[PDB]
Design an enzyme around this catalytic site. Structure first.
Site, mmCIF file in Angstrom:
data_model
loop_
_atom_site.group_PDB
_atom_site.id
_atom_site.type_symbol
_atom_site.label_atom_id
_atom_site.label_comp_id
_atom_site.label_asym_id
_atom_site.label_seq_id
_atom_site.Cartn_x
_atom_site.Cartn_y
_atom_site.Cartn_z
ATOM 1 N N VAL A 55 0.925 -1.226 0.144
ATOM 2 C CA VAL A 55 0.115 -0.007 -0.142
ATOM 3 C C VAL A 55 0.833 1.216 -0.251
ATOM 4 O O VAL A 55 1.568 1.387 0.869
ATOM 5 C CB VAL A 55 -0.999 -0.054 1.460
ATOM 6 C CG1 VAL A 55 -1.631 1.195 1.366
ATOM 7 C CG2 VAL A 55 -1.815 -1.319 1.138
ATOM 8 N N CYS A 56 1.088 1.981 -0.956
ATOM 9 C CA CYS A 56 1.722 3.091 -1.369
ATOM 10 C C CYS A 56 0.820 4.524 -1.245
ATOM 11 O O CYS A 56 0.004 4.894 -2.082
ATOM 12 C CB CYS A 56 2.456 3.099 -2.805
ATOM 13 S SG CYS A 56 3.716 1.683 -2.696
#
Lengths: 159, 75
Positions: free
Chosen positions: A90-91
């Protein structure tokens, strides 16, 4: 030692708070009771989003110098989202290093992740394929793909 | 055009009397007694896990006053 003690005290109090007073939309806890820095979480696709109803398992891994540095988050359940790398990472901006602050908690992070499912960030996406479908064909293939993700997630949830 | 919110006025929280040896199956059976939800409609969630029917509350280290999360099939 002080850094390891501070980080543990905060995560401990957060865990105790969620055990007794959970927040709607997600559940979070320790993978192994003996390790305060490796969390697992279940995130429910929020209402009025293409993800609504999905049951998304993810991992949340804190460093020893939390809250000075953010945790890293990875979806275990397969998901199709611009800010989620193909490997599940998850960026999002709140986890870099709208930014990271030493006041953010697991709850604060889930609030941002839930909002992410409703409004992706268009600057430097982690899944260019998903980002393209979301910009150009949101209610077509993108909605179709996300619908599959949602169906699969509910299948494993009621196995 | 504007936006408003709508929440249930009824307390959605369920209170149960349990023993640490109770299985997740027994807990779902007690939820049915109060709310009338068939067990195979429920999944219980705690500490970020899908609780499995065959395990006990003790297996998940669920103490007194803890709150479990209830997942339901959507129709």
């Amino acid at each position: 030692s002080m850094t390891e003690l501070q980080s543990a005290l905060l995560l401990r109090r957060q865990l105790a708070e969620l055990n007794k007073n959970p927040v709607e939309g997600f559940s979070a806890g320790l993978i192994d009771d003996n390790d305060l820095y490796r969390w697992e979480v279940l995130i429910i696709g929020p209402p009025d989003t293409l993800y609504e109803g999905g049951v998304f398992k993810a991992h949340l891994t804190f460093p020893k110098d939390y809250p000075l540095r953010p945790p890293k988050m990875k979806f275990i359940t397969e998901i199709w989202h611009p800010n989620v790398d193909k490997n599940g990472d998850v960026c999002i901006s709140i986890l870099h290093e709208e930014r990271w602050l030493p006041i953010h908690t697991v709850e604060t992070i889930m609030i941002s992740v839930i909002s992410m499912l409703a409004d992706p960030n268009g600057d430097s996406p982690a899944n260019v394929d998903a980002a393209k479908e979301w910009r150009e064909d949101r209610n077509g293939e993108f909605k179709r793909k996300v619908a599959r993700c949602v169906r699969k997630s509910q299948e494993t949830a009621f196995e | 055009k504007m936006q408003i919110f709508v929440k249930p006025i009824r307390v959605k929280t369920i209170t149960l009397e349990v023993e640490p040896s109770d299985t997740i199956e027994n807990v779902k059976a007690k939820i049915q007694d109060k709310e009338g939800i068939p067990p195979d409609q429920q999944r219980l969630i705690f500490s970020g896990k899908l609780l499995e029917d065959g395990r006990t509350l003790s297996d998940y280290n669920i103490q007194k006053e803890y709150t479990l999360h209830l997942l339901l099939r959507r129709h």
